[PDB]
Design a protein around this motif. Structure first.
Motif, PDB file in Angstrom:
ATOM      1  N   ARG A   1      54.540  43.114  45.804  1.00 32.55           N
ATOM      2  CA  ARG A   1      54.281  42.490  47.096  1.00 32.55           C
ATOM      3  C   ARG A   1      52.851  42.002  47.185  1.00 32.55           C
ATOM      4  N   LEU A   2      52.655  40.920  47.962  1.00 32.16           N
ATOM      5  CA  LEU A   2      51.338  40.358  48.209  1.00 32.16           C
ATOM      6  C   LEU A   2      50.700  40.977  49.445  1.00 32.16           C
ATOM      7  N   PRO A   3      49.382  41.122  49.417  1.00 32.33           N
ATOM      8  CA  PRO A   3      48.637  41.404  50.647  1.00 32.33           C
ATOM      9  C   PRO A   3      48.579  40.151  51.505  1.00 32.33           C
ATOM     10  N   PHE A   4      48.035  40.309  52.713  1.00 34.59           N
ATOM     11  CA  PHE A   4      47.856  39.192  53.625  1.00 34.59           C
ATOM     12  C   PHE A   4      46.591  38.428  53.277  1.00 34.59           C
ATOM     13  N   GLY A   5      46.511  37.204  53.789  1.00 35.19           N
ATOM     14  CA  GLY A   5      45.288  36.436  53.709  1.00 35.19           C
ATOM     15  C   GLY A   5      44.387  36.749  54.887  1.00 35.19           C
TER      16      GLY A   5
ATOM     17  N   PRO B   1      42.896  50.399  55.286  1.00 31.07           N
ATOM     18  CA  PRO B   1      42.008  49.229  55.360  1.00 31.07           C
ATOM     19  C   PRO B   1      42.742  47.920  55.089  1.00 31.07           C
TER      20      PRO B   1
ATOM     21  N   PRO C   1      42.355  45.169  53.385  1.00 31.74           N
ATOM     22  CA  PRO C   1      42.636  44.616  52.040  1.00 31.74           C
ATOM     23  C   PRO C   1      43.866  45.188  51.373  1.00 31.74           C
ATOM     24  N   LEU C   2      44.308  46.375  51.781  1.00 30.42           N
ATOM     25  CA  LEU C   2      45.425  47.054  51.138  1.00 30.42           C
ATOM     26  C   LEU C   2      46.767  46.769  51.790  1.00 30.42           C
TER      27      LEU C   2
ATOM     28  N   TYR D   1      56.073  38.867  44.731  1.00 29.48           N
ATOM     29  CA  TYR D   1      55.528  38.103  43.616  1.00 29.48           C
ATOM     30  C   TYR D   1      55.895  38.775  42.304  1.00 29.48           C
TER      31      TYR D   1
ATOM     32  N   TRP E   1      42.135  31.637  48.047  1.00 27.71           N
ATOM     33  CA  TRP E   1      42.145  32.766  47.117  1.00 27.71           C
ATOM     34  C   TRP E   1      42.297  32.158  45.725  1.00 27.71           C
TER      35      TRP E   1
ATOM     36  N   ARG F   1      41.426  51.428  43.485  1.00 21.63           N
ATOM     37  CA  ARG F   1      41.944  50.458  44.442  1.00 21.63           C
ATOM     38  C   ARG F   1      41.550  50.828  45.864  1.00 21.63           C
TER      39      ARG F   1
ATOM     40  N   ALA G   1      38.898  48.636  48.315  1.00 21.77           N
ATOM     41  CA  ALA G   1      39.212  48.150  49.661  1.00 21.77           C
ATOM     42  C   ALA G   1      38.107  48.462  50.657  1.00 21.77           C
TER      43      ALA G   1
ATOM     44  N   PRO H   1      35.484  44.485  52.038  1.00 29.15           N
ATOM     45  CA  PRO H   1      36.402  44.023  53.090  1.00 29.15           C
ATOM     46  C   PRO H   1      36.884  42.610  52.879  1.00 29.15           C
TER      47      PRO H   1
ATOM     48  N   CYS I   1      37.956  41.157  50.113  1.00 33.95           N
ATOM     49  CA  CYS I   1      39.000  41.027  49.100  1.00 33.95           C
ATOM     50  C   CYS I   1      40.377  41.298  49.687  1.00 33.95           C
ATOM     51  N   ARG I   2      41.402  40.990  48.881  1.00 37.17           N
ATOM     52  CA  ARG I   2      42.764  41.436  49.143  1.00 37.17           C
ATOM     53  C   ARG I   2      43.314  42.051  47.869  1.00 37.17           C
ATOM     54  N   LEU I   3      44.176  43.058  48.021  1.00 35.08           N
ATOM     55  CA  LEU I   3      44.650  43.818  46.874  1.00 35.08           C
ATOM     56  C   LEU I   3      46.166  43.888  46.809  1.00 35.08           C
ATOM     57  N   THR I   4      46.708  43.775  45.593  1.00 32.96           N
ATOM     58  CA  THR I   4      48.105  44.115  45.423  1.00 32.96           C
ATOM     59  C   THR I   4      48.286  45.621  45.389  1.00 32.96           C
TER      60      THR I   4
ATOM     61  N   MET J   1      45.813  43.783  41.160  1.00 36.21           N
ATOM     62  CA  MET J   1      45.035  42.560  41.252  1.00 36.21           C
ATOM     63  C   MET J   1      44.194  42.578  42.519  1.00 36.21           C
TER      64      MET J   1
ATOM     65  N   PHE K   1      42.297  39.837  44.812  1.00 35.33           N
ATOM     66  CA  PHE K   1      42.167  38.423  45.114  1.00 35.33           C
ATOM     67  C   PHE K   1      40.818  38.167  45.775  1.00 35.33           C
TER      68      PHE K   1
ATOM     69  N   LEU L   1      48.105  33.399  50.133  1.00 37.82           N
ATOM     70  CA  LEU L   1      48.452  34.689  50.703  1.00 37.82           C
ATOM     71  C   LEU L   1      48.896  34.482  52.148  1.00 37.82           C
TER      72      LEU L   1
END
Ligand SMILES: O=C(O)c1cccc(C#Cc2ccccc2)c1-n1cccc1
Lengths: 141, 134
Positions: free
Chosen positions: A72-76, A85, A87-88, A95, B30, B48, B52, B56, B58-61, B90, B92, B133
């Motif tokens: 799965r993708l995170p959000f933009g 948080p 980013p997670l 994907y 991204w 990971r 995070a 702040p 970034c974005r993470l799988t 990953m 981003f 994203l």
């Protein structure tokens, strides 16, 4: 062409046939002496089931590649709510990645996926793809 | 409330403090990232979580699994779908310049720890067309 019982094949088999037809047009290098995984195709969107079928059909069509699982993708911008948080946090968009040994074959596969999904109904036609590059390669085990 | 993840974040921040490169762009796309793998599943998870907190922007799988590479000998090679026990995630990012800084910071951070943490690997990666994203 082969036809399954009752006059149909599974979606992943038809994907493999479509990819084979498109890729037959391009006689580009798919491997190197060094055998390093320097290139990739990043495939996302559509729906989980459409990506599932595409991933299975890609593997059937291309022995020279290696695939991750579906994830799965995170959000933009502006992630949805959650206790972790930002980013997670995980979206519902899925994907997978394809690893390849040449940059040109990644380009050819990206274009093949784009051409193939454009012939399918939604949600499959909403699948997105970009080539990717790994500066130091990925040392697959 | 999570001292392990916070300690990793603090260690990353100290290494990242040495650089002031832009982490975001007006375009917001991204286009780069770091691909982080190996070590162990738990050590990657912890990294990971620390990433995070320290980044702040970034974005993470999630963690996932790597397929196999080439097998030595005359065959058979693994099928493309086969999954190994080696995991990855990953990161981003909006700038390649910060991807390079983050790659260097991760390498410098993990080499201070014993196995399996020190066996975590990282490479910069780029996305030709970006990743949209959601
Ligand atoms: O939990 C893991 O395996 C792990 C994974 C990635 C990084 C670290 C770290 C660190 C660090 C933090 C502050 C200063 C210097 C280094 C880590 N870790 C943390 C404690 C033991 C191991």
């Amino acid at each position: 062409s082969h036809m399954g019982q009752g006059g149909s094949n599974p979606k992943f088999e038809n994907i493999a046939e479509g990819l084979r037809a498109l890729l037959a047009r391009s006689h580009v290098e798919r491997t190197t002496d060094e055998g390093t995984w320097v290139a990739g195709v990043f495939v996302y969107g559509g729906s989980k089931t459409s990506l599932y079928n595409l991933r299975r059909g890609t593997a059937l069509a291309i022995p020279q590649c290696r695939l991750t699982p579906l994830s799965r993708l995170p959000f933009g911008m502006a992630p949805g709510p959650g206790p972790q948080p930002g980013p997670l946090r995980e979206s519902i968009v899925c994907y997978f990645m394809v690893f390849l040994q040449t940059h040109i074959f990644a380009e050819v596969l990206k274009d093949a996926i784009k051409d193939l999904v454009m012939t399918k109904p939604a949600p499959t036609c909403n699948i997105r793809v970009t080539v990717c590059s790994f500066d130091d390669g990925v040392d697959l085990p």
